[PDB]
Design a protein around this ligand. Structure first.
Ligand SMILES: [Cl-]
Ligand SMILES: [Cl-]
Lengths: 167, 167
C-alpha cells in the first residue's frame, strides 16, 4: 500500500472552496482591497477558483497574484498589483510544516505592507514546525509522519482529487 | 475611563505559567535541545520564570535567550547558544496583531535553523493581522479594537497583574 485512501473528491473540493470563498469575504467584510496570491504550484489554480466563486456571489472580481514558491525555489512570480494596504490571502493546496507558507509570507512582506495577510489552504495535514496556522481550511487531515498528501486539480493533473499516501 | 478590569492576578499568572511550562516540555517530549527566547520586554522575565518552573519539575535547566524587539526596534539581543537544530520557544507577554511575533520569528531564522519554533504567550488578545498563532497561551482575552491589554510583572513593574484598559 503506497496509495492509502481518498481524502477528497471533486464535489467535496468544490464545496470546500466555496466555503473558503465565503469565509474570506466575511472576514474582509467585503471585497475592498482584497486580493489572492497562489503559491506552491496547485495553490495558483485554487486561488483562481476561489476568485471565480467570489465574483459569482459578490459581483466584483478579485485580483489573483502568483508566487510559485517551493522548498527555496520559485518558477514564476506575478503580482500585477500593489500589496500595500491590501487584504492579501495566500492560497496553498496543503499546509504541512508551515515552512513553505512562512517563506511565502516572507516574500510578500519584502514586496509591500498588506493591511492584513490571511492563509487559506485546501488541506491542513498538521505537523507544524513553525507558529503558522491557516485562517481558512478546506479539510483537516490528521496524518502520520510517514504519510503524504497528494492534491490533484484539473488545471494541472486533469482531475480534482485529494489522496492520502504512505511509505 | 482608561482602566476597565483586572484580567489576571498574581496567582492566576503563576498557575498559567506553570501550565505553559508543562505544555512546553510535553510538546518537546523532554528538555532535549530546548531553549526559550524572551521578546517584547516583559517576555524576558516570563521566559526566566518558565525556565525556573521547568527545572523545578524536570531537573535540568533550560537556556533563556533575549531578543528584546518591539515595533522595528531592539534594546538588547543575547542568545548564548546555537539556535540550529534546537527546539526554540519564543516567549511573549501579549499576542496581538502577530506582527511583533513575526518580526521575532524573522530574526531567529536569520540567526539559525531551529528544529522547531514554538510561540508561548501569557495572553492572546486576538485581532491577528498575520497567520501567526500561539502554541501555548496563558489566557485568551476577547477584546475590542479600542481596548488595550497591560501586563505588569514584578521584575519590571513591581507587581504581577494583567489589566484591561480602553479608550
Ligand atoms: Cl508549509
Ligand atoms: Cl503580536
Amino acid at each position: 500500500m503506497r496509495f492509502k485512501a481518498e481524502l477528497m473528491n471533486a464535489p467535496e473540493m468544490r464545496r470546500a472552496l466555496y466555503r473558503i470563498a465565503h469565509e474570506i469575504v466575511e472576514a474582509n467584510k467585503g471585497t475592498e482591497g482584497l486580493a489572492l496570491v497562489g503559491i506552491h504550484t496547485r495553490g495558483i489554480p485554487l486561488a483562481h477558483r476561489i476568485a471565480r466563486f467570489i465574483a459569482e456571489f459578490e459581483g466584483k472580481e478579485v485580483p489573483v497574484g502568483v508566487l510559485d514558491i517551493t522548498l527555496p525555489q520559485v518558477r514564476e512570480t506575478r503580482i500585477p498589483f500593489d500589496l500595500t494596504g491590501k487584504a492579501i490571502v495566500l492560497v496553498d493546496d496543503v499546509l504541512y510544516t508551515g515552512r513553505t507558507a512562512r517563506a511565502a509570507l516572507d516574500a510578500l512582506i519584502d514586496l509591500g505592507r498588506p493591511r492584513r495577510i490571511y492563509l487559506a489552504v485546501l488541506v491542513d495535514r498538521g505537523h507544524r514546525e513553525l507558529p503558522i496556522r491557516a485562517d481558512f481550511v478546506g479539510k483537516n487531515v490528521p496524518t502520520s509522519r510517514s504519510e503524504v498528501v497528494k492534491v490533484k486539480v484539473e488545471e494541472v493533473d486533469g482531475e480534482d482529487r485529494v489522496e492520502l499516501w504512505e511509505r
